[PDB]
Amino acid sequence: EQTIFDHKGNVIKTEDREIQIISKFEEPLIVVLGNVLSDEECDELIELSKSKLARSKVDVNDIAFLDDNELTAKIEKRISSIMNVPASHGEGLHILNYEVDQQYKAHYDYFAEHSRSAANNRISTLVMYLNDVEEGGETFFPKLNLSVHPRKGMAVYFEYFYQDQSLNELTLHGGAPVTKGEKWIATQWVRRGTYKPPG
């Protein structure tokens, strides 16, 4: 099958940065990427997460995705070149923190048949590692026996838009328990069609 990700060679030359292609698992397509985010961009994304939370009072505490800003739009543009899909298909920079012994149990990123979101389903994912994880925290694909270990500024790309649906089901993945330290990530989930309202 043809893939969305359409990049030959060892680097991806985007407008503001050069991405390194580190390794590939060819089908379903899984790619480890280097140099995706600067150290300072990783730190700044974390900070935006903590600030948005620090502004919660009784958004209301009683009732995730960063607010759009110069930094998030610059990063979404860069991601857009990597993923070969316009930024408007992106759900936005979703920030996630794992404390020790937290994990993300294996799942599919594309939506179940019963979600209304399945009207415009997800097609591909980028997981960016915003810090270094003392122990644990690997992104693992249990049906492929593959795992990507977190590393600040690196990312894992994968897609699930294949005609053969058994290939999409191979993209079952999760975030392994953090056994020491903590883990910060940004995820960009990309939809088949435009997702953000115009701007």
Ligand X SMILES: O=C(O)CCC(=O)C(=O)O
Question: Interface residues with its own copies (CB under 8 A)?
Answer: 8-10, 20-27, 32, 34, 132-138, 145-151, 154, 180
For 27-73, give the DSSP string. TTEEEEEES-S-HHHHHHHHHHHHHHHHT-B--BTT--BPPP-HHHH
**Least distance to ligand X, CB of residue 144, Å:** 14
Letters for 155-184 (x = contact with ligand X by CB under 6 A, - = none) are: ------------------x-x---------
Beta strands 139-141; 173-175: pairing state: antiparallel
Q: Answer with the entry of ligand X, Co ion, its own copies, none that 175 interacts with (C-beta below 5 to 8 A by kind).
A: ligand X
Letters for 129-148 (x = contact with ligand X by CB under 6 A, - = none) are: ----------x---------
CA distances from 5 to 29, 60, 98 (A): 8, 39, 29
Can you tell me which of 19, 33, 79, 185 binds ligand X, judged by CB under 6 A?
185
Structure-block tokens of residue 113? 């048949």
31 binds ligand X (CB under 6 A): no
> 162 near 168, Cβ under 8 Å?
yes
The residues that touch Co ion, with contacts defined as CB under 5 A, are: 109
Q: Answer with the entry of ligand X, Co ion, its own copies, none that 185 interacts with (C-beta below 5 to 8 A by kind).
A: ligand X
Q: What is the DSSP letter of 144?
A: T
Complex with ligand X: residue 19 or 133, whichever CB lies closer: 133
Complex with ligand X: residue 117 or 187, whichever CB lies closer: 187
For residue 28, cis peptide bond before it (omega within 30 degrees of 0): yes
All residues at 6 or more sequence positions from 80 whose CB lies less than 8 Å from its CB, including other chains: 86, 87, 90
Interface contacts to ligand X, rule CB under 6 A: 104, 109, 125, 127, 139, 173, 175, 185, 187
